[PDB]
Amino acid sequence: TARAVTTCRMCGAQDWQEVVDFGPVPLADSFLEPAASYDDEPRYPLAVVSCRSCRLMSLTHVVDPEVLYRTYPYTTSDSETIKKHMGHVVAVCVERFGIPEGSFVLEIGSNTGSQLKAFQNAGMRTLGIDPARNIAAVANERGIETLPEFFSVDTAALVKKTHGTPQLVLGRHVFAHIDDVSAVAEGVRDLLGPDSLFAIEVPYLVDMLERNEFDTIYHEHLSYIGVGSLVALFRRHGLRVVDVERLAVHGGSILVFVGLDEGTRATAPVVEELIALEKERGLYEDATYERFARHVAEITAELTSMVRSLRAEGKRIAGYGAPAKGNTLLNVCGLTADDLEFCCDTTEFKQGLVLPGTHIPVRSPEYAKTQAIDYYLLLAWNYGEEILAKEGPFLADGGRFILPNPRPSIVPPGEHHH
Ligand SMILES: C[S@@+](CC[C@H](N)C(=O)[O-])C[C@H]1O[C@@H](n2cnc3c(N)ncnc32)[C@H](O)[C@@H]1O
Ligand SMILES: [Zn+2]
Description:
It is built from 14 helices and 19 strands.
């Protein structure tokens, strides 16, 4: 069902270093209705390779995008963390590049349309592109125009014809989800005018390696990206990386701005600073990735033993959150419903379902509060600050959290952190 990678998406070479292999794993966003057996549950090979030319890190395989995205889970809410970051994206894009009010912003992977809504509140014209039909119907209903398609060279031409030249094209946590990134670059090139920008937000490979964030490896995530590999791609499509901002969101990310090579946007010094930093931290050396793989085996082992040791002492453990990355973590660690009795999640879509592979039940936060849990394994650790800030009562009662990265730890710690 899932097609194997041959050549590299970004630079086109074929010199792959193997880094880690988790074997066959079910899809992280395929939540299941509870049942007696789960024998026909699909699994796909989940393994990562590193390109020695440009140092894109890629999965060995590409699960069909039609299967992944045509019906996708979503929330109707949005946390305060998410809202604030979306406001920040607007501020950066508009203030750093002087985008006037009334300008046109096109967003790829626009989802329910809240990021575009933010742009509209700042006086912009918008349009979204997202293949999730269920989610696009919601955006459209709310008043956020969204084409229910994948982004392509042809869709790009349709947009230009009917909607004109965008001053900004935005893709947040979608660029790493697309196999044919050459085609994205080409459709972008055709959309961009002389001063237009293409901006993408993706998890940063430097942070992913240094903080041992192996749970962000899942089938939707085809690519794990540094600035180097983006320059290698965009070189070959008349595009130039002109600016980068590092961000704490999603365990360390980069928001990368790209313009036409012959356009009016000058390259800022930070671009080369980050490429020099990637060298200096060893992204172009085989040892670094063997070290990453070493860390993964070590963290995986001590996380399971910590959990099983506390259960042997008669402590009750649950998962806090049921995000996609939590399902990589739990499957790789081999944890079952005997290890975690449930995972609480605020998404109603997920409540009453069961997780892929491990089949742990997903329950509401209001059920979770009735139960005497001793430890929550914090699966949604990227929202650690927002979560801990509202869990005073649990913490005051002696409840604890287990954080999986950079190394497994226990919150609260034994002394004031300073
Ligand atoms: C993880 S989400 C990101 C949602 C939102 N941008 C955010 O940052 O929260 C991935 C989204 O991109 C959409 N998507 C996946 N492949 C796409 C493609 N080739 N073109 C446009 N959208 C795509 C999915 O339907 C999904 O809504
Ligand atoms: Zn490459």
